Ligand binder design. Structure first.
Ligand SMILES: CC(C)CCC[C@@H](C)[C@H]1CC[C@H]2[C@@H]3CC=C4C[C@@H](O)CC[C@]4(C)[C@H]3CC[C@]12C
Ligand SMILES: CC(C)CCC[C@@H](C)[C@H]1CC[C@H]2[C@@H]3CC=C4C[C@@H](O)CC[C@]4(C)[C@H]3CC[C@]12C
Ligand SMILES: Nc1nc(NCCc2ccc(O)cc2)nc2nc(-c3ccco3)nn12
Ligand SMILES: CCCCCCCC/C=C\CCCCCCCC(=O)O
Ligand SMILES: CCCCCCCC/C=C\CCCCCCCC(=O)O
Ligand SMILES: CCCCCCCC/C=C\CCCCCCCC(=O)O
Ligand code: NA
Length: 382
């Protein structure tokens, strides 16, 4: 029975999570500071997220331990301790959203990316995100709370003084706030937007790669049309497709060799010289094996690197959802099913631990998925 025993377990697990969350995320921040190849806008959002995770370990976890005792407290002081973690969760959602959008600009408008997405603007965005996060997570302190209807028997039983409550999460934070405002509007909607941004990212990477492959089969389909053609009207036709395809590819060092050759051969076809156009078009086979093939596979290789980075970002966002959704779903049962008995305490505490674990996991993702983080991690440790 002794509540101190079950409490001892919950506390030592929370403290273990805290140590890990602080250590791992301190290493992320140190790595970005030391390695100028990690100083890019994407990674300022990683740092902001790492800073939220550090604060989970230093403040949210000590707060959660404190609030699990039900200690007597002025109700608004209780709300701050109860709600501060909602600030950190929101800040995380905003950083994750920013990363998604960053990776989308990078892949869908590489033209204007560096031009549109700068480091001083990113800092301004992060500041605004933290301010909003405070405003959302501390909204119960503006009056959307249960401080005006305190549980007087619980306060008396605990020996609390005048104008104090027993400080327990569900006693002071209204469940309509947690479900409608925090979960549906501030968590769920952003996560679905994120899901939409990632669907768009992977679709765009796919269309771009089909195109590269498409333009490439066209240059080749047409080069066999030319080589087996009989009428001259055909050479013109097939070589005309190579040109257009040659420019899309250029857009999508020595393409001007390729286009110059098509142009040479084109003029021959129009002047009725089929055998010499066919032979001139044959030069196109060399410049392809020396240049055009080169654009192709490096473009393929850069594209795949961006998809890889986007996958890494999506995993981090998926793991956030996974760690936090159970608590939100429990709150939905509590709120929407009064006829149901309340989820038991051991499960409440498992869901809280699970959410806190999220703050440990990201450094491992970085280390296993991003070579530059991993290399920087290994150097720091020596
Ligand atoms: C960078 C840091 C060290 C700056 C200084 C932080 C100080 C002001 C903080 C850290 C710990 C805090 C204390 C933590 C707990 C309590 C108990 C509460 O019933 C009254 C406030 C009181 C006594 C706090 C007062 C402010 C405090 C002393
Ligand atoms: C944020 C950094 C710089 C400092 C550490 C946070 C400090 C300010 C936090 C940590 C714990 C908090 C306290 C927790 C409990 C109580 C008792 C309640 O009856 C009034 C509010 C009061 C006194 C809180 C005031 C703010 C507090 C002291
Ligand atoms: N419902 C809930 N409870 C708690 N803590 C108190 C757990 C509890 C619940 C009932 C009870 O009688 C005694 C203790 N922390 C909580 N944090 C959250 C939360 C954060 C983000 C989403 O939900 N929900 N939440
Ligand atoms: C480098 C230090 C990192 C760890 C810092 C942890 C500091 C935790 C700060 C506050 C914990 C909350 C304690 C509140 C106790 C209230 C007790 C009371 O109301 O009488
Ligand atoms: C991050 C800054 C850390 C600075 C050190 C802060 C140290 C204070 C930590 C915990 C204090 C909580 C003690 C609560 C005692 C109240 C119980 C009581 O006496 O009735
Ligand atoms: C300034 C930084 C921290 C201020 C701490 C405020 C403590 C409020 C005391 C509450 C009380 O007397 O019950
Ligand atoms: Na987080």
């Amino acid at each position: 029975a002794p509540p101190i025993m079950g409490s001892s377990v919950y506390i030592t697990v929370e403290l273990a999570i805290a140590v890990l969350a602080i250590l791992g995320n301190v290493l992320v921040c140190w790595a970005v500071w030391l390695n100028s190849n990690l100083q890019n806008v994407t990674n300022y959002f990683v740092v902001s997220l790492a800073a939220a995770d550090i604060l989970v370990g230093v403040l949210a976890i000590p707060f959660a331990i404190t609030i699990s005792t039900g200690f007597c407290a002025a109700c608004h002081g209780c709300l701050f301790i109860a709600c501060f973690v909602l600030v950190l969760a929101q800040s995380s959602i905003f950083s994750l959203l920013a990363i998604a959008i960053d990776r989308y600009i990078a892949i869908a408008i590489p033209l204007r990316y560096n031009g549109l997405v700068t480091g001083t603007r990113a800092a301004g965005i992060i500041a605004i995100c933290w301010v909003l996060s405070f405003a959302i997570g501390l909204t119960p302190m503006l009056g959307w709370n249960n401080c005006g209807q305190p549980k007087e028997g619980k306060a008396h039983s605990q020996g609390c003084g005048e104008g104090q409550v027993a400080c327990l999460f569900e006693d002071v934070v209204p469940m309509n706030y947690m479900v409608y405002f925090n979960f549906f509007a501030c968590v769920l909607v952003p996560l679905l937007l994120m899901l939409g941004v990632y669907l768009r990212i992977f679709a765009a990477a796919r269309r771009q790669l089909a195109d590269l492959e498409d333009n490439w089969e066209t240059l080749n389909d047409n080069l066999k049309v030319i080589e087996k053609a009989d009428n001259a009207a055909q050479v013109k036709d097939a070589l005309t497709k190579m040109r257009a395809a040659a420019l899309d590819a250029q857009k999508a060092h020595g393409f001007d060799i390729l286009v110059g050759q098509i142009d040479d051969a084109l003029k021959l076809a129009n002047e009725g010289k089929v055998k010499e156009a066919q032979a001139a078009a044959e030069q196109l086979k060399t410049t392809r094996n020396a240049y055009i093939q080169k654009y192709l596979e490096r473009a393929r290789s850069t594209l795949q690197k961006e998809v890889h980075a986007a996958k890494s970002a999506a995993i981090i966002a998926g793991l956030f959802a996974l760690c936090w959704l159970p608590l939100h779903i429990i709150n939905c049962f509590t709120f929407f099913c009064p006829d149901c008995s309340h989820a038991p305490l051991w499960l409440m505490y498992l869901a809280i631990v699970l959410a806190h674990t999220n703050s440990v996991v990201n450094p491992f993702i970085y280390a296993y998925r991003i070579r530059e983080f991993r290399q920087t991690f290994r150097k720091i440790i020596r």
